[PDB]
Amino acid sequence: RYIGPKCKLSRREGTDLFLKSGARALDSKCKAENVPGQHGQRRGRLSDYGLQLREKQKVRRIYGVLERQFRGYYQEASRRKGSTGENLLQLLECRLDNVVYRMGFGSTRSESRQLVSHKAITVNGQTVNIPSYQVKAGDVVAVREKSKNQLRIAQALELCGQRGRVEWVEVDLDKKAGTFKSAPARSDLSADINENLIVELYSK
Amino acid sequence: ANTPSAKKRAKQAEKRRSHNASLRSMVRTYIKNVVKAIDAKDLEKAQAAFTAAVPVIDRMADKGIIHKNKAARHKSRLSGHIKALS
Amino acid sequence: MVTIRLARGGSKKRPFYHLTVTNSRNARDGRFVERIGFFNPVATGGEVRLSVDQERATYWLGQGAQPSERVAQLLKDA
Amino acid sequence: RTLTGRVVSDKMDKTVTVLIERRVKHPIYGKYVKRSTKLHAHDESNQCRIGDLVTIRETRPLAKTKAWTLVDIVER
RNA sequence: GAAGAGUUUGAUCAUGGCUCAGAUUGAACGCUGGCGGCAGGCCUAACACAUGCAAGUCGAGCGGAUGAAGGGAGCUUGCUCCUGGAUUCAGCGGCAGACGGGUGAGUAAUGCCUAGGAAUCUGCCUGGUAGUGGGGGAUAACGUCCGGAAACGGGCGCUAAUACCGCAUACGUCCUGAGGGAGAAAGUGGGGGAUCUUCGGACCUCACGCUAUCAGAUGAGCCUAGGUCGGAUUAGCUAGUUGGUGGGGUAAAGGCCUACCAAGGCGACGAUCCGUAACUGGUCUGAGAGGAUGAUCAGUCACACUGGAACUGAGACACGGUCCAGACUCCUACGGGAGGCAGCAGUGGGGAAUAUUGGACAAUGGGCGAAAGCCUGAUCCAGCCAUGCCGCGUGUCUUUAAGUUGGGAGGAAGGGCAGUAAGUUAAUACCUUGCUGUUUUGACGUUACCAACAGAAUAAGCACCGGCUAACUUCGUGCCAGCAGCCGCGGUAAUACGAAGGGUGCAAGCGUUAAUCGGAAUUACUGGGCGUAAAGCGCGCGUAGGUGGUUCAGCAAGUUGGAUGUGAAAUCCCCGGGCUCAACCUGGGAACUGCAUCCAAAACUACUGAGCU
């Protein structure tokens, strides 16, 4: 998890990051028109390894993940047989931190990672409280039956067809309970990553 | 220090050693006299001398002061040279 | 001295046994003569309780090994 | 149960030493080297001269540094 | 399944070293700290050790100490003569103390590891085979005396046995192996109707014991081959050494011990001496080859202040045994005595540096026991320490952790008992035992874990920002003060040094000191060099050795395939199962490139033979 004020992290990349605070926009009042840092009124020399850094240091800043946690996820890519780049983002989509919002129970990942620690998101009739569970293809996803009249769960159901459907789940909005159908490939992702170029920041 | 579980076996060992020293020496003086018998070359007492010894070499072997095949060798060493007196 | 015996593997507050055939000249967890199958009293779904194979368990009873006290009433679970 | 070597010294009674040679590989160098092994063989009748070839058998030790007896003079 | 940069020069190229990215540990140190689970925690002084504890167990093996109760006699409920037997437990005796535990000092080779080999014992255990009869002498406790403040000594005198010694007896077992000779044991408790009587005993009957052997399991001992650390600025070493026999001896082969006979033995494939070190499964970096390496874990070894030595015992040359010697230390009432933490705590002392004078035998073991159980600093498990390895939390109006309260499994296998059935029984009379169903009871950690409650109240820090790391204004300071791994930076607008002001690395940790491998083709077998960079002796004769023209045939040592035993388990590698997830835990296999044996092969090599030029 990364904490603090988050308007300043929407400026380095250029992409919306799916990191916001309300329900209308992003980078529309927190003045995203420059390149921040110590002194960034001028650019220059935007090339390979520092870009391979800015690739992984974006992917780190979205998914609530630390380099204690994330470069152990490259360790399973070599434990995976073949096609290491998309098989990195497999476990980031079998991640439960993202798929609460990929369903849409919380406003963002910053409310998705939080409530599952506050004993909201069960897996299969058990009590799971980790933002690292690996959801199999074919469990239900339900909510504990005391956070149902939590009304900021109802402050997330407006962006289902507004942030666009994912077309990989089948959810019941009446129960506030979902079901993760299957694992994605590299067609179900946003096109702002470079999956076999995060790989190249391993030997240097 | 030491324990009275071991202080009891302080007496139980050395007193038992004293009984096992005599009975052990009661063996090997009988074998010496039936080697003195061969070294005197007189069969006429040598036959009567180790037939007094064989009831002692194995009777000690039977009660676990010595082992039973130490007896089996010395019953075969002395006989294999009394036969040589011929 | 030859004995079939429960022997602690596993973790602390996580018992796992091997049912070693030992000599009672060694420790519980070192120099076993034979491991026949295991035991697990924390057995939950999917974990088999005990892998007792009577193909070899006859042999040490046949060659003169003994249960300790509990090993007798694991064979009584049959 | 068959070890073969050529006779190199016979000037003692009932005892002979042979060079049981071999050629085996060096582990990290790959070149097959010879490794000479100089056993002691016990003769029951002392009929082996220097340059003879014999085979031997293992038993209980016949002396110190001797646990192998003579089987048969194979050739000369 | 393998990533390179920077740096010699005015520039280049080549040879060649330096410094750097990484991953690591048994970790320190400088900083700052919320929690859980599994882990790990003298790496130095095998330094010295106060204190408590680390192996006592048994009365159903035996003599002997003390008197629960109860029923009675007197005095009259105070008391003992008794009657009795509940109980304990210092002295004998069995077994254990040879295990668990710890440490790595010694050891360069028979220690370890891999393969094989026979000339041996093994208490308790398990299958049988044969047997428990009859005697005898002591001995402690106890009695007192002497010496001593005590500790303890040592004078006689009592008594026992599952303590000892003969005699009887011999299915094996040993000798001679003709014939023959030889030598064993112990009884105790739960019972029992007929005859002997004091159906206390005897006999009957199971239970624990006891013995003489065999086969096995389980340990433990020899012997051979292989390899196992650095040096030739260590080349000769060796006399009981190498064989031979006679004997002697070990549980067992063997110059192991011995006398005498002979002159052998070891070694340039590295002997001997010298320095160093437990070894291995493995571990760490690696594309692998390898290199480094032996902390937890498991096998073997080795040691117990230091050295020598046996004793008892199935098993020791015995860590909480004895003896002797040495060093040290301690109590003395000066007579005489005692001690050995590399056992768990703990203390100095050394050091960069490492923990509690904890809880209980409830689980697993053991050690005795007929059983009950009794002990165990082994263990199960707890404090202490970010020491790793995982998860987790510090808020985007939820309450997780934490804390309050209420709840709540699993660790328990069984023991007591009083029926119930069974099969040994001569008599399922009766004991003794295994079965069944019920009742009674026993958890060190006392909880994990579930569900309520108050409210963001209790949570972030570190290092850098000149380059090749795309984190990259100024202010103070002026070849000062300083920083830094390589270049370098500072000599007056400082992106290189000290703050502030911002970012960035990844997070209860971040960094730098140290060590290991790496990139390093920078010791190049894979996989390098030598005219001038470092490097051809100045060249010969030639010993071991390395390699060897040519053909048929043979051998099957190297080579090649399959077969079988292994290569322990662990670790690792995949598929899993579980902790709500990950570590961790295991199940299954994979792996273990190895070793000998076995058969099959004959192109090539050695060897063997006849040749060919």
Domain ranges of chain B: 2-86
CA-CA distance, A132 to A19, in Å (whole number)? 19
Tokens of C5: 């015996």
Residue with token string 């050629």: D23
Amino acid at position A187, single letter? S
**B2-86: which CATH topology?**
Methane Monooxygenase Hydroxylase; Chain G, domain 1 (1.20.58)
Q: Give the distance between the most distant pair of CA atoms in chain A.
A: 55
The C1' atom of E454 and the CA atom of A58 lie apart, in whole Å, by 40
**Distances from the Cα of B34 to the Cα of A4, A110, D51, angstroms:** 107, 105, 51
Distance linking the first and last C-alpha atoms of chain D: 21
Q: Residues of C46-70 as b/e, b for ≥16 C-beta within 10 angstroms?
A: eeeebebeeeebeebeeeebebeee
- Cα–Cα distance measured from residue B12 to residue B32, given in angstroms and rounded to the nearest whole number: 31
Q: Obtained via which technique?
A: cryo-EM
User: Which of A156, A90, A93 minimizes the C-alpha distance to A120?
Assistant: A156
C20: left (phi over 0), alpha (psi -120 to 50) or beta: beta
What is the maximum span of chain B, computed from C-alpha positions, in angstroms?
64
Using CB atoms, list chains with 3+ pairs below 8 Å to chain A.
none
Question: Max CA-CA distance within chain C?
Answer: 37
- Residue type present at position A80: R
Which value, to the nearest 10 degrees, does the dihedral of the CA atoms of residues D39, D45, D49, D50 take? 10
Protein-proximal positions, strand E, CB < 7 A = 3, 21, 37-39, 55-57, 90-94, 96-97, 99-101, 116-121, 123-126, 164-167, 173-176, 181-185, 211-213, 216-219, 223-227, 242-245, 247-256, 262-267, 269, 289-291, 297-300, 311-314, 318, 320-322, 338-340, 363-367, 378-382, 390-400, 410-414, 435-436, 449-452, 456, 465, 469-473, 501-508, 510, 525, 545-547, 557-559, 568-569, 574, 577-582, 584-588, 597-598
Both tokens of A152, joined, read: 């900021």
CB atoms within 10 A of CB C34: 14
Of A72, A82, A86, A20, the C-alpha closest to A202 is: A72
Per the listing, tokens 């046994």 go with: C17
Resolution (A): 2.9
- Judge contact between A33 and A10, C-beta under 8 A: no
Kindly state the DSSP code that residue D55 receives in the 8-state scheme: E
First-residue to last-residue Cα distance in chain B? 64
Q: Give the DSSP H or E segment for D33.
A: strand D32-34
Instruction: Check residues 129 to 158 of chain A and report those whose beta carbon is under 7 Å from nucleic acid strand E.
Output: 129-134, 146-147, 150, 152
Classify residue A107 by its DSSP letter: S
DSSP labels for A51-63?
HHHHHHHHHHHHT
- Kindly list the structural domains of chain C, giving each domain's residue range(s) and its CATH number in brackets, ordered by start: 1-78 (3.30.1320.10)
**How far, in Å, CA of B1 to CA of A74, rounded?**
62
Buried b (16+ CB within 10 A) or exposed e, A147-168: beeeeebeebeeeeeeeeebee
**How many other CB atoms sit within 10 Å of the CB of residue C41?**
10
Report helix, strand or coil for A143.
strand
Structure tokens at D51: 């340059």
